[PDB]
């Protein structure tokens, strides 16, 4: 259940030259490449150790691809600005997310592309990968446009063939890191917040991939869990905690339940004093 | 790797 995905971001800065443009490539939950046009002669560069052995033919191609996308996304920012009847003074954010997924058998499973203007779903590619769903009535003009040019055709060819082929190449090149299942190191911490209440915080540290399920249960049978967003440790692994407010003295009634690919069976924790 | 074509809206 692997994937190769890219996240493109274009930001119009009127009167301060061409827009800001950034591409980042991810295999599963590991960034491996990046492009930033905010530099003189900007280039696609390796951002995983296992990507530095690729030839300059690769980087030259990726550079040109990312450069042409920046150029197209500049035009797109002009066009969309025109559709929403917005000013040439405001800064506007076009976001593009595309990727392919491999099944259990390791063959193509599914592809997706989505556009967003000012952080809002704009134009989604359908699961048939041959047509678009304009989420907004402003995106209808775009939908009609991308169908006239048979734009989905070329995206299908990338998502079905090229994307899957290179996902396989990356999974081999970076296999020592990418195919390693680091399970969470898990524990419970008690934080008194008042006379009557305390906080049980269930930790999961240095786990990969990022997908993890943390839930609190009570012997018998609970308050609604505080669940912080999954954060990077900065070493390729991830951290996450789930917290629950409980009456003080009644902490050993609550169990934490962790689920991760790197765990054969789900782990149960309980706070001991 | 990146797709060669970027859709024009």
């Amino acid at each position: 259940s692997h994937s190769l995905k890219y996240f493109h971001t274009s930001v119009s800065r009127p009167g301060r030259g061409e827009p800001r443009f950034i591409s980042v490539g991810y295999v599963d939950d590991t960034q491996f490449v990046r492009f930033d046009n905010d530099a003189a002669s900007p280039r696609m560069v390796p951002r995983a150790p296992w990507m530095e052995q690729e030839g300059s033919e690769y980087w030259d191609r990726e550079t040109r691809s990312a450069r042409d996308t920046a150029q197209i996304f500049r035009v797109n920012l002009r066009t969309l600005r025109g559709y929403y009847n917005q000013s040439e003074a405001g800064s506007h954010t076009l976001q593009w997310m595309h990727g392919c997924e491999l099944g259990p058998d390791g063959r193509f499973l599914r592809g997706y592309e989505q556009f967003a203007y000012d952080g809002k779903d704009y134009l989604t590619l359908n699961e048939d990968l041959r047509s678009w769903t304009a989420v907004d009535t402003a995106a209808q003009i775009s939908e009609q446009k991308c169908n006239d040019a048979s734009e989905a055709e070329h995206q299908r060819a990338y998502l079905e063939d090229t994307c899957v082929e290179w996902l396989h190449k990356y999974l081999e090149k970076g296999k020592e890191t990418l195919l390693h299942l680091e399970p969470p190191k898990t524990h419970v911490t008690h934080h008194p917040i008042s006379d009557h209440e305390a906080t049980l915080r269930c930790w999961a540290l240095g786990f990969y991939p990022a997908e993890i399920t943390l839930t609190w249960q009570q012997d018998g049978e609970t308050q609604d869990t505080e669940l912080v967003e999954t954060r990077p440790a900065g070493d390729g692994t991830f951290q996450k905690w789930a917290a629950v407010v409980v009456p003080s003295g009644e902490e050993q009634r609550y169990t934490c339940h962790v689920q991760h690919e790197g765990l054969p069976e789900p782990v149960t924790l309980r706070w001991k004093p | 790797r990146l797709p060669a074509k970027a859709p024009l809206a």
Partner: T-cell receptor
Amino acid sequence: QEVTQIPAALSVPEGENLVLNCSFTDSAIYNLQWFRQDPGKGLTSLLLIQSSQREQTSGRLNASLDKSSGRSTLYIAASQPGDSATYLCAVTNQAGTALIFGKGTTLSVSS
Amino acid sequence: NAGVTQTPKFQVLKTGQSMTLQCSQDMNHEYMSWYRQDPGMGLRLIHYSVGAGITDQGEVPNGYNVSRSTTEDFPLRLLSAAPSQTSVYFCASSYSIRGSRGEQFFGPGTRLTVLE
């Protein structure tokens, strides 16, 4: 992208049928376009075939597109002296931002 | 309407001299291209534009500059004329590259000869 036109020069008697060929390395194209050039003049578009389209017919000219094969065939039915000119082939480049052209086939329809 | 207009039609340059090949279209075409044509080499994309203030280089861009200040005009500047740049230069525009309305229109062409 590279576009090749086979042959480079063609000389056929008037009244005869003839094929101008054009093949391209990259199949992922939007449009293929055939052009005419008279000596010391510019290019005038003859036919435009979309990626989705298969045929485009204009009188005695029929251009065909096989995206898979990566070739287009321009059929000139019952040739006339007035056809004597240079014919060029062009597809949308990798980026899809400008047309990339072949050397072109220099046609001479002898009277 | 005039289609695509080019000036001059013929020009002679001494090596090192600079000049601007003028090109304009009154068809409001967002896409404009500059090509050179020399025997058995075909049409070689020098520079291309996808709108006002957006420029990029093609197959053989070395020796030339371009500006797309306006939708209407796409001048080509030879910075330092060389014998190798002796060719016939064609300016071209189209409403679309990827769309159904992709008819590309060319200028009458500029014959340039550079001499020592």
